[model samples]
Target: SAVSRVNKSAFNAVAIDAKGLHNSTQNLSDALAKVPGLKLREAGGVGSDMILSLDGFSGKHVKLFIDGVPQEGVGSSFGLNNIPINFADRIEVYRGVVPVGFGTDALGGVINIVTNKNRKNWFLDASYSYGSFNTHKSYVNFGQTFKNGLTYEINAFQNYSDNSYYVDTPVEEFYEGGGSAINTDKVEHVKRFHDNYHNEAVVGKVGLVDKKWADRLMIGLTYSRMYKEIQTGVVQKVVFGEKYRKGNSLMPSLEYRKRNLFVRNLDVAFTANYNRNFTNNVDTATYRFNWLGEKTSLKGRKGEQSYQDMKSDNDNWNATFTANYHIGTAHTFVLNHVLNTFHRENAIAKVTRKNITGFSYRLMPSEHWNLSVFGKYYNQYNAGPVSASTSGTSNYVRLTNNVSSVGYGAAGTYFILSGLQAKLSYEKAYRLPTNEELFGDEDLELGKIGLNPEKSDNLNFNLSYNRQLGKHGLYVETGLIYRNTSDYIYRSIETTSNRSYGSYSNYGSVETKGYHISARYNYSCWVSIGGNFTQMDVRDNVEKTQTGQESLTYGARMPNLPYRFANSDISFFWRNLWKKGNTLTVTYDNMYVHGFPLYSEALGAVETKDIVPTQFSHNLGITYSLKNGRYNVSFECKNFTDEKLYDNFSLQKAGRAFYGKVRVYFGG
Candidate 1:
């Protein structure tokens, strides 16, 4: 059913089968990285900061949703990297062209997590796993529906890790001499001592479904908390032993939906949510530490990096409204609107608001072809403090800025043959600056004001074929993508005398042209194989610098972004392995990344320049199920070859980890 839904859509979209991955140790990030044209790069081990790139745009350019509800400003505890694959029933990925029903400002694409909402009298699903670095993960979800059209559900999950991985880095030795001498020329292989991380979250909801007055109505509340010990700065060489961050979020939400709402062939849905979050950054240590876990006392009162104990109070409000009118079986009209507001209580006292309204018309004149045309209006307002000079004196002044844009697009697909399909789509999209980019996170990331919004013209074309012959099935897809973008926002690392931080700025112009291909084969219910590859030439289009000088990096590929990558997986299944309604499965998967430079290619020599080397990682997993998947056990080995994998700023990842899990499911 999910595959059929994706094939019938006009947008360039894909669906991940999350149910099939429940028995493995993979998280949401690991599952998403296998899709074509999608990349998830993390700075370190579990519970670390990450960036999700689609096509060529990354970070805030891409949007996230849960059951069509925007997941913004929810705090780090609910990050995708910390979520388990079993939390969702499926994942929907829209590349380049998105449907207007979402009503959000996204320059790249959207990823929507669809949770299980099957109608059942009662159900329970629980799982737990343990792995390297003293890591532990657990998840539980239970729900029940009564005979009176009333339902209730509770979901909870948690993650913890010591993250004491080893890496090779230059060691600094300090002496207690009068002159305070230090040596930084020697490199050593050491283990991380202060990189512990953990998080916990719970959500509960009550609703009435399949009613005459309203098809569905629900109220929910979510609570999440996280704690992380600082390991390194933007660069790996800058380490800290006593700095840490902790945060928590509380959100309450409402959802309502109805069909034939006071009119024939009419449907409407509305959702609203508010979140209150608090974050504390603690760096009040009066000493510094090296890679050997050795500390040196400071002469005066100062922190390991900065002497501050700061707390940030962040609040967010979001709401969405949608209405659809079906003219006939062949045509439909849809309207959607979304509103979001963010406020933070910190030194700068920043506030931002965004509103998006969109409309689309869909036409399905025949079973073989369909088309959709849509338009969107985006508006954003930002208020913050800026420095101004009056009579040669600099002072802070409050300023309010407003930005608005209009976008339109069209998408159409046709079934050329019985099993062959072709699709084309285009959109002129805009992405507003996020709260973390405009106002610093009060931790590792520094913010900058006066940043411009990113704008892009995106085009995509795809061809796919799906066929089944007897006990054999095959599916193949290929796509071409192009993007012409202006004022692209990117993060740049800055180093002070003590530590390194990251800041965001708008790069002038850039171009991207890429293609991706994917293939999958299935033989009965025993064997399955799938693979995909993506390559993109993302280059700078600016010919001159801000100082009116010729740019040396013009026409060169962008740095810090992967240009070539691939993923492949194979699985073998045995039915009735030990008993009736029992199955056994073995799976192997590999990931390849051809790394690139960490900075401009023209700034340094090829031999001396900083580069992220090519990486190849493999994983093996085995799952055994009994009683038609009511009980399951699995074991997984990740990076079994112990290869040194790296990402974002040449940060090393965990090596050679093993995990075992047990899952139980029960329903009527």
Candidate 2:
């Protein structure tokens, strides 16, 4: 099985039961924020850019999947923040070292989302919500199955928001006196002007089960369309009056799985998916905008901030295959392979392809001890340009590079007591640079042509315990991780270049050490309380020299990554308090993050450099179910404390807000 219980698994894994929480949650980000070792940051209000970080590694360092297949080439049309909560049955997070079954080159970890599947029944569910900032959300899910082993299912969703939230931003006004001069630096609470967002998506799957040749075969298609108005630059220093992005994706997929293929105790699963996406960035306005919603005409320019009207067409295909054989009941062997290809057409044509092959063996000689060993081979081919400077003038020289590498790891679990487990895992992994990093966005982000892949040696250790005591259940988990990475990739802001945006670059090396602990207590079904705390110490270990002297950044804390974060929540449930078959529940959760430096203040001024402020916020939510859970209604007051919060620097999160939802289902 690709999934396992967190307390019983041999790896440091955290799983969230989305199916159980969907009735009360609005989106995937809401459900994921409660789990341990995970953090989600939203750039603004609804439908804004959301970033997910784990253990200290940002979203780009992690791998994302849907139903055990990698999510590639979807473009920016769909994100974790916009995906409906009802889309998945469960969400799993693997920390530090990923298992061999998911054969992807993830440097930090992997996140696998498994959508709802068949249960040999028919059902229909519909939900809708309206909230602050004129936000609206809707979801529809329906499925049908016949006795003849035919099944069809569809999930559809839509989101829209004005996103005109209040934010306290540093107000800047400019004047042209031979050159641009700053006139105002007062920070004021203002409404966001150009931050509207909307998206629509539909996913459908049709399949046949109990066939003669295969146990199941399914065909699936995913379609998504998105449009968002750009409000500001990467940092919120400058505002944009007329810049936005539009994107659409159409993905067709196929899946096949069989419990026994040609032989007993042999199982196989295969999936293939192809995505076609088109993106257009429109930036053609002849004005300059200020934070105060003031605009000035530009003398001879055709665009406000940039004069780019670019479009990109992307075609991507990915496939995965797996086969497992059980040599008796105590031993198993597994073989897995994954292939992915990406091609983009724009002003410049780009292509990237990769293949990963993995093999693993597992042994469970007894009930108390378990072990597994795995190895993977990775190969990548990238075609791009290299700057060739010769004879004063320069041109882009087309080039192709092929790289190959290998990674191996081992993991084991031992049951110390009847309810206690000890687990450890290690992996030597590599994460290839993404296409966007190698090729880059048209204007906002520049690309780096010559960059090396990042390599890491990771180690993980965990201790978990779960027990039931006198009508009450208790679970505790603690884990530690260490990673030493070479050629570490990071985004550097080019504040001085003509394109004063950001670009991806490789650093010398980085070392990270982190530990976390989580605990939960449930008293029957009436009350529950749980919380988690994580602290990490990450530093640059690049022992290099500038001017033949030791570097000042050596041993300094890695900038922009939080070192401490904590979450706590309590829930209460009342059964049949109002009437028979009626239940009421209430939950409240609070989160805290310690402030950290924005850059290497170690070698520069400490007082002038900014820091991501310490964040503290609270959320309260309630849900009611009627008539044996056929109908559900939920209400939430997020950021109830009305505290100003910052996730990425200078960007303010949504303030105090209210949301309500109603849902109906055919299945009781």
Candidate 3:
């Protein structure tokens, strides 16, 4: 529901200003560090290992979602610290006007995660945290609703640390006129490590509203599991051991809400999901470059390493079908059909000092099987070497694949006046490519089996406005996105992680435009304020790779992109503290960014780094209520202004930190 410049009276759900949900004493990419034009690079505060770039887009193509459902793969139900920031409660953040049914490979814009529902009476909340390097976090949630409509919820969380600092790898310094540059940095500190994460999930849902068996019917189910670990900090110094990751997700739903049939205000929804992912990585490293290094030393120690013994198994399936009708009240018809499938298998083993020669699992090289079926989950498979290469002298060979996608969409919601609201949608999306971009046994640009599937044709438009005064009110929503792609694969560096070789093009056409605004005001009863703003412009009409030997438009920006972005927040509320009601919150957030220059044509002397600086944060919160829900406590001061930020556009950051949380709740 969107349409506005000015208009609001009530009903609103727009949130996205999460800095690790307050009290974030660093880490977690410095807890978003006040967002804005994100760009963080860390090597401390817990084994340092982060590379996030916003505006310029990074995170492989950041596409996280919860309510709209979707979170990278190798499996499902996911974990990125389980969306941290306390299991989310609200966040729509459609920055770049993103909304092509989640099918633009996230050109930057889309962070929808809305959770916390399951309470008709029973409720429970928990918190526990301690900061400064040896970080920790604890969480708990409980819910129950039964008035003939069953509902249940359970949430659990855990976070650990052991990372101090260490990051700088380029090697070789010296040049008075000697000639030879590429030493981005040379620092080298080892022995800083720590990483551990645990999670729990439980959700029991039941909603059966049948009034004539043909008027309304509903049902839902969900299941989640996660486990992540990483203790290889220090980059690798003492055979550091510990690398385990796991994930799983299962969801089922069914619903029907029709009022007059034949198209009057009908609604039907059905969804299905199953996901699984695992990562052994066990002290990983199984590479064999030099493919076209032309020689041996492309710098990777002359290239070749296989302490190997890796694992990356992924599986996913999804199905969705929704239909909503409203032909009379000024048009409002929505229909959707979606099905997706993903598969991965990358197992390796090669000990070679004098044993364990080779073991294989490979998969990822243009996997294909052709669309199977759809109404929602339909997947395919076929990606190089099913399993063969026990090592006859094997240099490196392994690949696996399987992917499928289907789509159908239609949307229309128009209200025009009275309060204003307008929407238009059309979509068809698909994607499948990952696993180091097809059988990455290193070497470079070598993965040819059959690749095709990355189709898109989407268009969406939106507007919103609502109004009210006295308690004050205002709201605005805006959007504009368009795309036309055909097998739009993309990727052609063939090699360049320092290696060299690239190919994987199918770019047909791409274009993305954006505009977003969020505003709120409510000064009374307590105090309320809000802010949100985004601007975008992506371009690429055509070019299947081969313009000047370098082409980029995977997500658009002409030469790549990171134009500008801004976010603002001001919150204050004091509900009863000494008055006995107990509630106090004061928030001040600010984010702003502007800078672009990473590449646009420069193949000769290309060395990279730059893009970080834009911050603001001043958070303070207090919650008191001893005997009611049990006990609660939270105190955070994440960079109260320690500034110093870095997020992928790399370099440095790990300053300012402090977090505290305590919990005590019973009644399971």
Candidate 4:
């Protein structure tokens, strides 16, 4: 029902129901992989870095939120890949045409995780799972609501993994006479030795609800930390034996909401939070290691990679305010504001701030049609060290910069028939440069000063049909997307004899055109089948370089990005299999990706260029429930055929893994 409600709104959006997946052995990333125009790419096994791409945009172009609260600068321990599926009641996805109530500057889209807000006397939920590669995961949630409008809740989760997966790589062998000469004609199968990872997080809240003066109010605190052992650099060939990283984050927050603050047709909501994060990178090893785990001492006091002991502290503050006023039953207006500040301490002392103000109007004459129009204003300030040059000498100097812009958009929806709907939306969006892009990470990426913001024109259109026969249901949806962007920030990687680094630069222009189709079929309440496919053509649009030279990559496809992908799944259920309140379910899913080049397509011959091969992966799941889901157990086998998969260039993922989970629930 929630999915149907969101699908009928004016915005181009979709909602995934997560309540029924509480007993399944899937993470939030696994649940979202089924979306039509989205892709999730991971570098390795559990706890590895992941990138989410919507349509044709990736990285900072997309924004994340929890209960309508922004989730930036919180640290990797709270990333979408690490969260459990049970943490949310439903997930809302808006593509290209976001609402003004969020007060965000996202150019691609928004993903909002809506947590459960049900009122109960008392409740508890707990689960744990163990899988291949010595992996373990656990989660617990409990809460209570009193008759006097007092409520308290706590949620906690943790993950650990050895990540000892086997891969095919080149092996280096020393000369017999103790010289630096080596033979490079052998490739061997090796397992990751130093890639252990673990993380833990806890969240607590206390609130009061259903009061006369205020509808709801709450105070909250969150703590998260992670420890990671560095196994390889940007590429798998460069290995590390004694390199690692660790970080921790602490945040305190407040929230308030009321239906009528001072007037009959007015409503208001406010949220604020502050985060303190600390990180340390250690690379003090004085030896060189190989894929066989053999180490050789160096001449001087040198590290396996770079010799350094670095520590960084970061502070962030965020606040948002929103208000809505209704005029009679057909017209409404909304206003929103968001503020964010960042400060970092270490070798580089930098500060940045952002402010966003937005307003929108909505008209709904009847249930057949609705329209929304919105405008936004953005302001940003930065003060940090910038690369400079004077008298043929390069140096660094402190500089201050200020930037501002305006954006606008509109969305409309109409019901052509009782079972068919049409929607259209467009926006002129802007995305400011992030702190990482300007200041760098003090590690592999180099900083670039005086970087310009990205600007784009986004458009979307969709048509959906839903019909229910006597005992069968069918749903089909199709959509089109287009984008033309200027000053696109692109990262370029450079590799030397044994190390690799990356730097950011503004590419002149680019364009994207894409389409997607999805369909679902259901028979009574026993069988369900669904599948979706997407294809995007992202290419360079710049004809000339900054130096007035002809661009060689003109009209070439974007490198290191997937252009075509598809997903499909089917499920069968049997009710009252053994008893009155027992059930059994079987499910199967498949994923396919048609790979592309790892570099510019025009620079080299097709046979000489490195290419990521096409891949097909399959998974199977089975679950049995007793007493109407009060007790549950499940089993899963991922990549059952042991296919070699690589989401990132030269970074191999695990193969043919298995997992088992048990869960219990007691709620009112």
Candidate 5:
């Protein structure tokens, strides 16, 4: 059972170790979906686009990091869903407020992927997994550390999938006599022929540890590339045959850390990184294809809708510095600064940059009471081309903009008793539009240069209790959150029967409130059971549209988001199954999501708009470990009943899949 048995931090956070789980799972994003308040939405199979949302906020609202460095400038090269689980030692998910060391202006929270590089030792770990749909995943990690503090590390991974899963597709058959439309419900179970995806990556680090000058210093280089076939558009209605996307990134980075800089209680850490990316999107096909892999054509057309052979070259640089000083036994001071610069040369050329400087103060008046307050200064600069209409003629004009803002927050914890704790946190945060949103993504989605940044006033309250009784342990936790946001950025699809595309836009205002409850019980490390339930209510608060017209969607439920969801898991472990230090574990998980409206109810009748169906799935797995932990083999069956699964519209997911994994580790 790949369940975390201990909590390593006293703060308001959750930590998931990768040792047991990594050996059994392949995708990082899939394993993270079990955590409360976190949701994973993937487009399709391996290497497909995936989005991670925390509480009621989307991925852009939260910050993502690897080790202590931020992961920005994301495209196709690498993302949360494609990153192998074996790459990280553990994962940390922060709920409301992030620490000063993270140096992020996240309105929702933060997620950090921590690796085991700081350890002093020699180690080698390798894993391979094969599953249905012709999917394959593998990774290798090697590290060595000398007695004199010299260290070297390398990691390489790859993922590939044919993604030929079958799905129910609507087909329109044309007769030779006249071309009459068939029954509206006519559909066929067709295999996805153009949904193949694959990616490969390599990362290396050179550093010295336990040195006299600094605790740890290192230089690293990473190269990642991905090739994904475009299967469908925003919905299954628009399918492509010969369209695909490619991406590659080259990044070199430096890191420095020290426990005590100049003063005895002063600590400092710094990191600098620069990355170059190249992306190409090819969508030039002269014929249109149906779900059955049959092609038809319009004689005079050059492509389906429009021809595209777009290329984008981008450069991104980042720098971060953080310092902490312990004033006395009960007081501490913290300061952090982060700078990011991005330049893109493509059809839409732009240069964007931001600098954030923050300061914090922490006080620990007693062993049971702790509090912290922080503030940050945000500044941004952008230069891009904007379309201008003058004298009934449209032309592109170079436009530049500069903006600045300030935000602050506070968090505190109170231990009511030995087994109970209460916490409260709030933040006034802002998030700038991503480079892909400011400039185009070189795909179907267009950019909006004059888009305003999104801002949110967020609040969270948490309560938890833990106790041990005889040979059993019990834990319970619950949380409440409220968020008021303005200028929220969102993507909308513009499509009819003939042609369609997507574009980014800013919504007027939105307010959301949610609550979650979770509980767990473990009996002598033999039997473990846990479950969680979450419910949220979100509504549009805007009264008028961009043209000052009354908005029909005002006060309606937020569209395209699941408001109710739950997860439950049970595990049984047997020690010394066959030989000494050999163990066998079996686990089962069930997940459910209530049906939700896919679009605004005001759009049309219930039959006209799409609505997500109730989703229910069950997964079962078993693993055997030999020699205490040196070797592990696992078998898993997901959606064993062949239930129809859907996400991000009616896009179907793989059904009734089987997978097997083997892992070998030489050292911890």
Candidate 6:
């Protein structure tokens, strides 16, 4: 009646079936409800551009993996929509104190998709669905397994929607005097898109279990090709077009794993990943300005943002080597080294600048002493003012900056008495400068070449417990996190956006604190329910003072902190289709998220007093078995609540949708 093992600041996904809930008819964003502590800001119907986060971590600070390998393009972050949820056998939400073998640079968490392995059978299948926004999904799952320990899997998926619209408040009302304006004028077709998305991946796996030497080896190869229309909203002024974004993505991975390589009960792994993304930011803006002196004749200025038809192609490569050993007596030791490189090249017609590159390294070592140490070294390149030439002006058009960071961390878990888990961790983290942050010239753009990475010291603690009795199960885990961040990254809109002089120096300090709680209850194997909550308060700790160009409050709230977040799920499951085999089932799942106030002083906007509104969504699906138990058809309805919700720092919301799938699976 007491407790079991628990954790602080962790995601709870086990309460929901992990493996058996495999689905291909749904996109990745629809399934986030199953992963507590993970929240989604529904943007588009298929979630190709949805923004999601965990704990209080920034979306940019998170990374996603496919089969334990990072999927990325150079100098870029992972895009969840690029991977179809239907292609996963299960998803692993790895957080808290991670295992040493998982070499992720995430200070937040990891969502790794485990691709389905070929069992051993023959299969053929296709599916089609249509619903809201005139959405459609058409795809095929193909696979086969050979007796020679070889298997092949290829999944082709495509999803498209006209997309629902959300009202634009500012675009609707214009301010003339010093008072608020009431206008019904709104930007029509704010987030319109003509998206044609398709993906095809051919995966192969080969393994050899050599009992002759007590060695087990397996290797895998996968290539995924993607095509989609990237939609970019308006910037500066109204008008609709494919102005800022449109791209193609390619990701390929190779991995090797060996057990008992040199000794019994030992594992070794090597993984390499590569991906490329290309895009064009199209725009042609020309403005004319004529100003006459109040009492004298002055000069007229005409300028344009140089239309070079911006285009950028990025590439990323990552390699990780990990070794895990079963030392002895309930002890496992792990050592890992990771090398990652990112490169991006862009062409700006007139203001066109240079390319950007970076290198990152990770070192992790762990032992049963309940302790682990990790370190990271990051270096970036192409961080300075770029050579620019418009019509005639040859002065520095943009400012540039270079950034670097070195961080180290240590964490451990200890058992205090029985049924209790206590964990503590400390880290010294830093962020290097980014091209956008450093080279923003003042007269032209806001760029300073001497900018440094934001640095922080973080501490975390957790008390957790778990228990199960008979056919029922219950668990609870919770923890607290605090951070003393220096050189906080933020800008004052009133002063910084005023380029009459130049870009204001970025300055501030941040103090952040948060707590997390997760609980679960299993009524039975067929029915389970769970929920989790996280709350964090982050503030600029600088007292009323000037950091060069602006004055600020001593402890103003930082931008993009939602303060309170919670996730809950209810699931109902049924087994056996028409008394055939395990090839059929049905489920009804629902998830909820409460909205909190959000502030963005940097955007000349702040909405910290609004409820933001909570979002509730439901998913209903059913599968019926086909002939020989090798094929099945599924019908899934998403957003049953039809509740519309919006997320922080964005202009989109949740919408209702539907999908259908037909799959034929075979492997041995």
- Candidate 1 stretches with Cα past 4 Å from truth are 176-185, 346-349, 385-398, 433-452, 489-507
lDDT of 5 at 607: 82
- Candidate 3 residues 1-668, lDDT tens each? 12121112111223444423533332223344334444444433443344555544456545666655565542433344333565664455443333333333444445556565424467776777777767665666666655564455666555555434333334333346544344445444333343444445554545544354444454555556655554333332212233345555655555455555555467665555555555453433232211111112323432132344555655566655555555454344444555555554434421101000111111112222111111222244434432334432345454445555545444445566765666665545455555444544443234544456565565656677666767777766665556554555566544336543435655456565555566667777567777666676656666445445445444445543555566667777666666565566666665555555454522324354333445444444444444543655666665566654543344434555666777665554
In candidate 5, the residue pairs with backbone N, CA or C atoms under 3 Å apart (3 or more residues apart, or in different chains) clash, namely none
Better of 2 and 3 by TM-score: 2
Error of 1 at 654 (Å): 0.9
Candidate 5's residue-wise lDDT over 1-668, tens digit each?
Answer: 11241241234577887755776765678778877888888887877778888876886687888876889675567778888888878888887667677776687788888887555388898989999999899999989989888899999999998999998878546556635243448778889999999999999999888887989999999999999999888877677888988999999999999997887999999999998889998878888777878777646686565788989887889999999898776898999999988887545468888888899888988878788898888888876665544331256665566767888889888889998888888888888776556655333123334567889888888899999999999999988888898987777555463533436778768888999999999999899999999898888899987556998999998898888899999999999999999999999999998887788866888787888899999999999999988899999998998998887777888899999999888865
RMSD of each: 4.4, 4.2, 25.6, 4.1, 4.6, 8.5
Lowest lDDT sum, 10 consecutive residues, model 1, at 440-449
Q: What TM-score, to 2 decimals, does candidate 3 have?
A: 0.28
lDDT for each of the candidates? 0.87, 0.83, 0.48, 0.86, 0.81, 0.53
Clashing pairs in 1: none
Of 3 and 5, the candidate ranking higher by TM-score:
5
- Give the candidates in order of TM-score, highest first: 4, 1, 2, 5, 6, 3
lDDT of 1 at 170: 83
Model 2 TM-score, 2 decimals: 0.92
- Candidate 5's TM-score reads 0.91
The residue-by-residue lDDT of candidate 4 on 1-668, one tens digit each, is 77778878878898999987887777788888888789998988777889999986887888988987888768876789888998999998998888898877888999999898884789999999999999899999999999999999999999999999898887555456654433457678999899999999999999999999888899999999999998888888888889989998999999999998999889999999998988899999998877878777777878888897898888899999999999986898999999988886543357889999999998999889989999999999876665534331245566566778999999999999999999999998999876566666332123424567899999999999999998999999999989888988777545453643336667768799999999999999899999999999999899987556998999999888898999999999999999989999999999999988899978887988889999999999999999999899999999999999999888989999999999988889
lDDT of 5: 0.81
Clash count for each candidate, listed in order shown: 0, 1, 40, 0, 0, 23
TM-score per candidate: 0.93, 0.92, 0.28, 0.93, 0.91, 0.72
Task: Quote the positional error of residue 390 for candidate 3 in Å.
Answer: 15
lDDT of 3 at 421: 68
In candidate 4, the residue pairs with backbone N, CA or C atoms under 3 Å apart (3 or more residues apart, or in different chains) clash, namely: none
Query: Candidate 6 lDDT, tens digit per residue, 84-187?
Result: 56566666664433334445444555676666553446565565666655666666666665555455555666655555443343332323542333243633
lDDT of 1 by residue, 1-668 (tens): 97568755878898887988889877888888987899988998889988999997887789999988888678887879988898888898999888877878888899999898784799999999998889999999999999899999999999999998898888667765723333557678899999999999999999999999999999999999999999999877888999999999899999999999998999999999998888999999988788889888887878888888999887889999999998887998999999988886544567888999999998999989999999999999877655544331355555566878899999999999999999999999998876556644333123333567889999999999999999999999999999998987666545455744446668679899999999999999999999999999999899987546899999999888998999999999999988999999999999999978988876887998889889889999999999999999999998999999888765788889899999999988
lDDT: which is higher, 2 or 5?
2
Query: Which candidate would rank higher by lDDT, 2 or 3?
Result: 2
Q: Candidate 3, which segments miss by more than 4 Å at Cα? A: 1-15, 19-92, 95-128, 131-280, 283-419, 425-449, 459-463, 472-523, 527-572, 575-668
